[PDB]
Amino acid sequence: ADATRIAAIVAARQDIPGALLPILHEIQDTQGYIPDAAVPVIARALNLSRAEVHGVITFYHHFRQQPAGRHVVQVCRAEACQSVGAEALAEHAQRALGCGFHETTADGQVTLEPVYCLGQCACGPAVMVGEQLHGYVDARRFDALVRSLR
Amino acid sequence: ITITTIFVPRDSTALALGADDVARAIAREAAARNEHVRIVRNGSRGMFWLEPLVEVQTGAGRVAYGPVSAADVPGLFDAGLLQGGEHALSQGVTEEIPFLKQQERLTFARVGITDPLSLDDYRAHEGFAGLERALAMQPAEIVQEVTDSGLRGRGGAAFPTGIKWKTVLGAQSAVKYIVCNADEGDSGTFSDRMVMEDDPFMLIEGMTIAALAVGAEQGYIYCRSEYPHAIAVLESAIGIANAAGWLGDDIRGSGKRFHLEVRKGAGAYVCGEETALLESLEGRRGVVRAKPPLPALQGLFGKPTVINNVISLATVPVILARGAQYYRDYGMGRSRGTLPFQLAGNIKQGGLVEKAFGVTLRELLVDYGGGTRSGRAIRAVQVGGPLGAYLPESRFDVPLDYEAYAAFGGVVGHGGIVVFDETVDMAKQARYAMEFCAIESCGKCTPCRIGSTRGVEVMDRIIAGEQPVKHVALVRDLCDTMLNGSLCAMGGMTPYPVLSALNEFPEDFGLA
Ligand SMILES: Cc1cc2nc3c(=O)[nH]c(=O)nc-3n(C[C@H](O)[C@H](O)[C@H](O)COP(=O)(O)O)c2cc1C
Ligand code: SF4
Ligand code: FES
Numbered sequence A: 001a002d003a004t005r006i007a008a009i010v011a012a013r014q015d016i017p018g019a020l021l022p023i024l025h026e027i028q029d030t031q032g033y034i035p036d037a038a039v040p041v042i043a044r045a046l047n048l049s050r051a052e053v054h055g056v057i058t059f060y061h062h063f064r065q066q067p068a069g070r071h072v073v074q075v076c077r078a079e080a081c082q083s084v085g086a087e088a089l090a091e092h093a094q095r096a097l098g099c100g101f102h103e104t105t106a107d108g109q110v111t112l113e114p115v116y117c118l119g120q121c122a123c124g125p126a127v128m129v130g131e132q133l134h135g136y137v138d139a140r141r142f143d144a145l146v147r148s149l150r
Numbered sequence B: 001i002t003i004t005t006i007f008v009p010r011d012s013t014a015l016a017l018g019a020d021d022v023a024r025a026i027a028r029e030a031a032a033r034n035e036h037v038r039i040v041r042n043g044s045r046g047m048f049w050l051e052p053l054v055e056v057q058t059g060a061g062r063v064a065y066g067p068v069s070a071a072d073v074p075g076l077f078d079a080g081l082l083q084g085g086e087h088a089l090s091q092g093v094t095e096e097i098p099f100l101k102q103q104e105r106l107t108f109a110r111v112g113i114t115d116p117l118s119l120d121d122y123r124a125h126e127g128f129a130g131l132e133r134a135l136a137m138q139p140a141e142i143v144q145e146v147t148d149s150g151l152r153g154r155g156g157a158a159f160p161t162g163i164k165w166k167t168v169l170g171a172q173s174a175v176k177y178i179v180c181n182a183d184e185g186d187s188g189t190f191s192d193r194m195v196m197e198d199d200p201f202m203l204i205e206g207m208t209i210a211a212l213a214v215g216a217e218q219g220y221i222y223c224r225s226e227y228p229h230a231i232a233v234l235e236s237a238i239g240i241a242n243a244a245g246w247l248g249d250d251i252r253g254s255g256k257r258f259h260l261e262v263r264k265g266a267g268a269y270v271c272g273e274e275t276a277l278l279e280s281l282e283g284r285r286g287v288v289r290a291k292p293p294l295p296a297l298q299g300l301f302g303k304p305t306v307i308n309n310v311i312s313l314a315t316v317p318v319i320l321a322r323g324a325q326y327y328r329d330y331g332m333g334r335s336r337g338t339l340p341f342q343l344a345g346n347i348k349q350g351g352l353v354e355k356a357f358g359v360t361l362r363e364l365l366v367d368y369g370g371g372t373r374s375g376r377a378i379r380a381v382q383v384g385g386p387l388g389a390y391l392p393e394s395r396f397d398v399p400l401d402y403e404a405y406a407a408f409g410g411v412v413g414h415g416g417i418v419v420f421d422e423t424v425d426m427a428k429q430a431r432y433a434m435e436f437c438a439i440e441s442c443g444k445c446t447p448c449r450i451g452s453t454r455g456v457e458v459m460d461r462i463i464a465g466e467q468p469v470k471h472v473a474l475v476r477d478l479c480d481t482m483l484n485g486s487l488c489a490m491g492g493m494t495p496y497p498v499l500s501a502l503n504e505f506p507e508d509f510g511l512a
Helices: A003-013 A018-032 A036-046 A052-058 A081-082 A086-097 A139-149 B013-017 B019-032 B068-078 B117-124 B127-135 B137-150 B161-172 B193-198 B200-213 B228-243 B275-280 B310-322 B324-328 B361-370 B400-407 B425-442 B446-463 B468-484 B489-493 B494-506
Strands: A071-076 A112-115 A127-129 A132-134 B004-007 B035-040 B053-059 B061-065 B090-093 B177-182 B218-223 B259-264 B306-308 B337-344 B351-356 B377-381 B416-421
Touching: A003 A036, A003 B324, A018 A036, A018 A052, A018 B259, A036 A052, A036 A127, A071 A086, A071 A139, A071 B035, A081 A086, A081 B337, A081 B416, A081 B425, A086 A112, A086 A139, A127 A139, A132 B013, B013 B019, B013 B035, B013 B228, B019 B035, B019 B068, B019 B337, B035 B446, B117 B200, B127 B200, B127 B310, B137 B200, B137 B310, B137 B324, B137 B489, B161 B200, B161 B306, B177 B200, B177 B275, B177 B310, B193 B200, B193 B228, B193 B310, B200 B228, B200 B259, B200 B310, B218 B228, B228 B259, B228 B361, B275 B306, B310 B324, B324 B468, B337 B361, B351 B361, B351 B416, B361 B377, B361 B416, B377 B494, B425 B446, B425 B494, B446 B468, B468 B489, B468 B494
Parallel strands: A071 A112, B004 B035, B177 B218, B177 B306, B218 B259, B337 B416
Antiparallel strands: A071 A127, A127 A132, B004 B053, B053 B061, B061 B090, B337 B351, B377 B416
């Protein structure tokens, strides 16, 4: 993570109304995560306390405080995907990858995350990798798309 | 000299089903055959079982093929694609497909017809006609027009939109805001997503009319982080509208000012609650605010704030362009207008069905949906999202109308419809409702934050077959605690799927 770029990211946004979430997004988008060492920089620029900033980072599931694997694979767990087999897909994904949700494979290639609806509810089970969507995902298609990543 | 226009959708559902690969295969095939095509990346018509849905402009109108995979493209060319030749995947003239033709697409009129980022396409199909009329009215007249239309909040609470705007207009404040709630966190919903990806200018126009109606010069679209495509498309559209004078400090030379920006959410379902949304916009944890102060009076940064759902705002332009009485004539009772219903889940023909209020669930399930994807019988349908009740077949003939659903404990909500077939385990559904509440609780209320997890534990005992009668009673008790001790609908409506599952399918819980 590039500490100097983080300071610039914060400085460019520090007068935006409600700048904290846009700042956290830009740090995560460019560095991969929000490092603990960025919190004092954010806090000072926004005249917020460090605990306040850390509490926001902790509250929102989208934000991560440590790097993910090369690819974040999100498997939808919500109702419409459930109705067409999301539960079995989630069980298979953990067996095929060898790790649970919120975990990263041993080779560091895939981080498996749940997501609660991708707005793909009529063509599930739905999976997102980075920003690439996949519909109608069964065990075969899952293994295929994971193969493509590696 | 001769160029054939081909449409390949760029809606994220079409993209999830391979539309970019189809578009590249069509381009590669045209080049291999020395034929000239213009591949327009339209929104989606919303017939998702046919996506990617390729359309070709012919003398007879646009004809459709679907669903198309990249491997099908050489055969499509061989069968005469560029002339609308018949193929296994042919669907005929697109506007003649009954699923699409038998709709009342007031809000979704352009969706799938246009290039979503083309101002020329937008304005060739009535785009900005509502804004042009609104620029010639006094603010109170715009409020009155939206009032007369009968429009109610399409986020689900169905509060009369014009009354909401009247409050913001009448408030005394130099700074007022328009806030679009694009958090669309409910499973089974994608109508907001489709507006933002497939007809973004309509949302921009609707928010600009709202700004004119109440005296706001700044707007914010709060879009969930799960929708990266919507966010990218809205940002491009805002840039394009600004460059052409539809936004900024001198909109179309009127001297009216409106600036708009997109804010990305961060994975919290509860930020669809309007005050938790405001907290997030202001950079804080998404904790629901006590609501003796209405956001319409003290909202974003304590200023008078219009907060409306994407569909609510996106319906404002047609209300202005065609008039309140035209809009009000659709529907039934107090449910005036149309709603983009969303058919989702275990559904054979899922997608977007905009219809006047009063259509029944059975009509949508059978006449449009074609039954389940699996072919098994429908067993339970959750309407209105994860906080809606499960409906059994005995309720499928209630008209989809806010008051008629409320009367029996149904929730129209945003109009999303999630179909479960006979394999569904309603005890596992009840457990999930509790798990989801435990995951998403903002934490302010004890029954929501901790009671939900105890409900999971008890449901686990029920699913393992341990003392079903005792533990169902405990769940019932916990539900009453949530009904009476929740400060917003996350905790307060979690009992709706739980109690409807338990009441309608007690056999799944081990009971008689
Ligand atoms: C848990 C919870 C989630 C909600 N999610 C949404 C949403 O995703 N989109 C929306 O428009 N309203 C949502 N609401 C309703 C908003 O609080 C509020 O009704 C909003 O102002 C709707 O504007 P409208 O009048 O145009 O419907 C949610 C409420 C709760 C309690
Ligand atoms: S009911 Fe739940 S989400 Fe709503 S205010 Fe209480 S703790 Fe927060
Ligand atoms: S429930 Fe999975 S994409 Fe909506």
